[PDB]
């Protein structure tokens, strides 16, 4: 579970993201498409070309959800319920792919927050993404 | 493969005893039931609302036979699964959009079906060899993804 | 989350295991060692040879814990506190490994409980080992 | 190892700017901090109780440098990782008993470390080259397990 320390860490690092969340969301996707091409099978309907607006559009949505989980760090299961439902019932993304995105999100943050991406923060952000992923996957079976 | 002549023979010999028709239907159906999310690829099949509805669905059973068929033929090119599944690998990526992870889920289901079916006969050493083949097959199938 | 049907299924299946749980624990380890040899790295102090009393004994231990979990299917977290501790702070087995033992356990039950290893029972046991896995790795970090 | 020439050039160009001493200490330290279970191999290293205790531990720093040392050599034989890493694979298996999953975690951490250091220079495409590399190395390090 996430500790007070963890919560402070996450709010802090995410705090810094501010208004760039959108762009950092799009970048994490691109990174994921490039490094783990198998993830592409879920977006056959998307234009995955560099600077794709669909990707831009999608990065923003993902970012908003993360931003929402941070705002509700003490009630994520509830704050994310709807999204947990969508993923379990419609999208049905195989669970293994959450860890890939998580990973690309962490690289993206690292690449943008050198001052904040400390060992302690890194660990907190990793536990956090892991928790989001678990919520999103909780209603799979 | 990195199969030992001994490992090759164990695989080969148990398979000789397999009814692909039944094992194929059961393996694919168990998949749709254990890991409900794999049903995303079979909406056109019908009602998969229950174990029963899945296990009974003829469309599933028939796809199951098509899949183990292909698998079965792959066991004859155990020394070049890559080349045997190349076109099937492309199809799966480019046409079907099947996440390769699915190949691994099935493989594990396959092993449970074999154990289920052969009880005693499906010994630790025999499972080990099968685990190497399912892994091998999955890799072969995922090989052309880009 | 284990449904009531699930809890039912599990207790039935395990009900049938009976006095053979120990032999099945022992058999599952043997299958694990052979199929996923990387798992052996955690047992350097064991004689991993076929029929070894160390393996036999360990098999019993694992089986018993499972029993205990089936029995407290409603309060796993609590029923397995000690074990979650041990694994998180002493053993420190990597989480990936739990999936391998779980798998070898299904395979073992399937090979021994044909009539009982129905598709619905298969699904429940899987979920069950999953939860047991989650409990045992919950205090990792 | 499907490193296209351009992927190989990219790996190599960046590796030129790395201070292996430094990166080594950071990657290892961070592994012990993000996945504390990995600390199981270092009970003779002393105090690993907090991030500062880990990151500043003279032993972790020293070992990190060693590890990365071996890794850098690996980067000059991208053609023969398996060959390059064979005696090391055996040692990790037979003497150290290190679960190979450890090799993948470090790979991921190392990728975050490179992102941390190069910022914007660690482009999507460079990361994908490095992903193939860390994977190739972990695979080579696991090749001799039995
Ligand atoms: C923590 C990780 C994730 C978060 C926060 C997240 C969040 C979201 C959100 C907010 C949406 C849009 C739903 C809407 O239309 O309102 C979405 C859609 C979607 N997500 Fe997830 N997701 C995550 C992981 C994944 C992963 C790992 C994949 C596959 C690799 C995935 C595949 C999809 C797909 C295919 C859609 C539908 C997009 C469209 O058709 O526009 N998601 N996700
Ligand atoms: C042992 C691994 C597998 C093998 C050998 C295999 C083989 C095949 C073959 C031979 C076909 C026939 C299609 C054609 O030739 O046009 C096919 C189609 C297909 N497979 Fe795979 N398959 C495997 C795994 C999977 C899995 C695990 C899934 C999803 C759970 C999947 C989803 C599909 C789908 C959706 C089709 C399309 C059939 C249609 O047109 O309705 N396959 N596969
Ligand atoms: C289904 C999940 C598991 C359960 C219920 C379980 C249960 C147990 C139990 C009951 C013990 C004995 C405690 C004692 O000695 O008093 C134990 C110890 C141990 N377990 Fe876990 N275990 C599980 C998964 C694993 C896995 C997957 C591994 C590694 C691949 C593992 C590695 C160990 C080791 C190395 C020991 C200590 C052996 C010894 O020195 O006697 N466990 N576990
Ligand atoms: C890129 C992956 C790695 C490389 C290239 C590597 C390289 C090395 C080298 C060169 C040595 C010293 C050899 C000797 O003592 O003769 C060593 C030792 C060792 N490695 Fe690895 N290593 C890697 C990953 C890891 C990881 C991820 C862990 C544990 C989480 C680990 C655990 C150890 C341990 C415990 C020792 C023994 C140190 C001592 O007590 O003297 N290694 N490694």
XYZ file of N, CA and C in Angstrom, chain C residues 38 40-42 44 91-92 94-97 140-141, chain D residues 34-37 39-40 97 99-101 105 145-146:
78
model
N 14.805 -21.818 -13.141
C 15.249 -20.591 -12.494
C 14.695 -20.516 -11.068
N 14.807 -22.768 -8.933
C 15.746 -23.503 -8.091
C 16.701 -22.597 -7.331
N 16.914 -21.387 -7.818
C 17.846 -20.440 -7.185
C 17.489 -20.126 -5.736
N 16.261 -20.383 -5.319
C 15.812 -20.075 -3.965
C 15.976 -21.264 -3.063
N 19.011 -23.449 -2.865
C 20.391 -23.943 -2.953
C 20.764 -24.914 -1.854
N 12.554 -14.354 3.071
C 12.697 -15.108 1.835
C 12.944 -14.234 0.640
N 12.103 -13.213 0.558
C 12.164 -12.246 -0.527
C 12.173 -12.882 -1.887
N 11.174 -13.416 -5.607
C 10.618 -12.469 -6.591
C 9.175 -12.878 -6.956
N 8.294 -11.890 -6.990
C 6.892 -12.060 -7.313
C 6.562 -12.869 -8.542
N 7.375 -12.815 -9.581
C 7.094 -13.574 -10.799
C 6.931 -15.067 -10.480
N 7.684 -15.552 -9.538
C 7.749 -16.956 -9.163
C 6.449 -17.526 -8.624
N 5.719 -6.494 0.335
C 7.036 -6.489 -0.306
C 7.729 -5.148 -0.268
N 6.925 -4.113 -0.407
C 7.379 -2.737 -0.397
C 6.179 -1.830 -0.138
N 14.040 0.727 -5.220
C 12.693 0.501 -5.800
C 12.157 -0.912 -5.552
N 12.987 -1.925 -5.568
C 12.622 -3.339 -5.367
C 13.485 -3.881 -4.232
N 13.099 -3.521 -3.024
C 13.883 -3.878 -1.837
C 14.139 -5.352 -1.674
N 13.336 -6.175 -2.350
C 13.518 -7.645 -2.221
C 14.908 -8.030 -2.755
N 17.537 -6.742 -2.208
C 18.533 -6.532 -1.156
C 18.951 -7.869 -0.549
N 18.233 -8.906 -0.914
C 18.538 -10.247 -0.397
C 19.955 -10.682 -0.711
N 23.521 -17.916 -7.203
C 22.104 -18.265 -7.180
C 21.204 -17.038 -7.354
N 18.316 -15.099 -9.138
C 17.158 -15.295 -10.050
C 17.325 -14.296 -11.199
N 17.271 -14.755 -12.436
C 17.420 -13.933 -13.644
C 16.435 -12.809 -13.795
N 15.330 -12.889 -13.067
C 14.336 -11.779 -13.123
C 15.030 -10.477 -12.696
N 14.938 -6.447 -14.037
C 14.608 -5.261 -13.197
C 15.726 -4.219 -13.357
N 21.606 -20.936 -17.182
C 20.881 -21.407 -15.971
C 20.352 -22.792 -16.300
N 20.301 -23.612 -15.288
C 19.861 -25.010 -15.404
C 19.405 -25.516 -14.031
